[PDB]
Amino acid sequence: MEQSSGDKDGGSDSGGAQDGGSLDSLKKYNGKLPKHDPSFVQPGNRHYKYQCTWYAYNRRGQLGIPVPLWGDAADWIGGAKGAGYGVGRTPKQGACVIWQRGVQGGSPQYGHVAFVEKVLDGGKKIFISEHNYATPNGYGTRTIDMSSAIGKNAQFIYDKKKNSSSVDKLAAALEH
C-alpha cells in the first residue's frame, strides 16, 4: 500500500496534546519539554533518594524549576503551599503529579509522584513516565484517566519559578 511511493506513518507525533502554556515557565519552550541532564547535580540529596520523590526532584530540575526538599511524597502539596507554589487539579504537561498516601493511585505509605509527559484527548487522560520505582527492569509509562479515581487523586503542583540557573534559597538552603 502506498500513497506516493511508499507508506509512511507519523500520526503519533500528534498523538496527544502538548499543553503548551504549562505553568508559565514551560510556555517559552513552545510546549517542548526541557532537556534532562544526567550529569547535573542537585542539592536535594538530603531526602529519600530511593523514593519516587528523588526521581521527581531530578525531573523537576529537568523542567528548570528548583524546589525545596519536602519530607515525603504526600508532604509536597503542603510544602508547595509554604514555598509559594500553586496547587491545582488541572492536567498540565511536564509538571509532576502528587498522589497522597492512602488514595487510589498513590503508594499507601508515602503517596506517589509521577511526571506528566502528555495531556491526552484534551485533558481527559494524562500520560506519565517514570524511571525505576514502580517498574522493575525497565521504565514504563501509563495513561491515567482524570475522570477515574486515580486521576481525581492526582494533584498538580505549579511552580512560580521559571528561573532555572540561579541559586534558590529554598532549594539550596535548608537553613536560613
DSSP string, 68-120: PPPSSGGGHHHHHHHHT-EEE----SSPEEEE-TTSTTSBTTTBEEEEEEEEE
Cβ proximity of 51 and 44 under 8 Å: no
Quick one: which H or E segment has residue 151? helix 149-153
The CATH homologous superfamily of the domain defined by 17-34+43-163: endopeptidase domain like (from Nostoc punctiforme) (3.90.1720.10)
Cell of 27: 510556555
Q: What SS3 state is found at 160?
A: coil
Long-range contacts of 13-21 (CB under 8 A, 24+ apart): 16/118, 16/119, 16/120, 16/127, 17/118, 17/119, 17/120, 17/122, 17/123, 18/93, 18/118, 18/119, 19/91, 19/92, 19/93, 19/94, 19/119, 20/93
- At 62, the amino acid letter reads Q
Resolved by: NMR
**Calpha distance 30→62 (Å, rounded):** 15
How many residues make up the chain in this entry? 176
Provide the CA 11 distance to its chain's centre, in angstroms.
Answer: 25
Question: Cell digits for 133?
Answer: 520505582
